[PDB]
Amino acid sequence: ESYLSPAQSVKPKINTEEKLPREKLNPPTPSIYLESKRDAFSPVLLQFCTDPRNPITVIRGLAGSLRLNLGLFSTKTLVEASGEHTVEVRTQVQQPSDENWDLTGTRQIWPCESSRSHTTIAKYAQYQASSFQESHIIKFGTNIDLSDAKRWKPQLQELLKLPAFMRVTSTGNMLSHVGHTILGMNTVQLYMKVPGSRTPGHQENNNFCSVNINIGPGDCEWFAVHEHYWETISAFCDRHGVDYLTGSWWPILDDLYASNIPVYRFVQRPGDLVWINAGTVHWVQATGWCNNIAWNVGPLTAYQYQLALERYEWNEVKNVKSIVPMIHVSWNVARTVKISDPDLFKMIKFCLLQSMKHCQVQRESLVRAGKKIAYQGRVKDEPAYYCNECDVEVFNILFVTSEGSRNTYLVHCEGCARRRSAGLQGVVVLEQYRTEELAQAYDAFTLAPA
């Protein structure tokens, strides 16, 4: 029933039993300089950044290299262009990047206070500029959506200059094959910061790679740990009563060191692009006044695919929504992209065969019971569907119900639909791919020539 085959893993083998000397616990961060557009667009840079032994990479002065006008993301330019659209804020205690104090101010702790409120771009800008003039608690404007193509056209046009594997949208990007918007992953988000502004510890949604560019005049400090160590970090989180996947925590650095976990630490200056590889655990704090922009990409490597599917199934264990619908994505990739890496091919094809199976079984049981199944085929720009009750992805065979209005329907998985009416009375059952549609797509998906 798993969409993964353990025999196919490509994770690098790492000991952790081998005790590491001090210098291996503070490894250096790969720091690259690009002399030319030619160097930026080489497949060699793609290979370097996605290498599974390379959790995080900083590409120094990339902005200058490709003639990106980062001034289009200054607080001034952004205010001039903004509407009054509401944006979200986090309120936090201002403290040094390697500290997180308890309420007493006498010890370090893992949980990190970061509360939500709302403002506008223009009103956060006044706070940011007034902080800079000096005229302890701070506010961080976070996850500001630059998704409106018309309003943000000049900003977004500048990002088309990036290498393709870094771009928001690309045929080699798994997130460009969702067919719907996932704000902040396949659209750009903006981060407006004062010193002390923190993004606390996480892996990306569904372990996807991340791209982050520092605009504003100040620096950010980054901390990162290889995917290999995430279960140990997750256990400190349990120990200290804060949820790993959805909570707000800041590691105690000496805990990780005591645990034999190497920690990358480095500074991202204005114009530096940070590439976060698949599954890397990281946290970030502004040192000065700055803005950052970031989004996710899903490059076509077997390591990315594996880690996204593993986290998809772990989310399901933990009752957490995967905001990347990996089944839908997997079929779409197979339909439109040639795959020449044998490892990645094997995994996608295994996934599709489990999905084709699951569908066949449950179609069989519905016809056995006389349940009408109607075809509602896919149409351009249609989203992928999730169950209203348990938030699992629901691919192809949909269990829908009506009357809010009599013309809109909610989607459920089979399990949740049967809990609500074990005979499925009042449940309309749809299928978006005929059985032979899936059979033919699967047969059409063959390893391309390298």
Binding site: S114, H180, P200, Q376, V379, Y385, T408, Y409, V411
Partner: peptide, 17 residues
């Protein structure tokens, strides 16, 4: 066709309050 409803998916930092 039937209009099938979806929750919008959005990255958002964690929040404690």
């Amino acid at each position: 066709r039937k209009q099938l409803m979806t929750k919008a998916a959005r990255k958002s930092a964690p929040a404690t309050g």
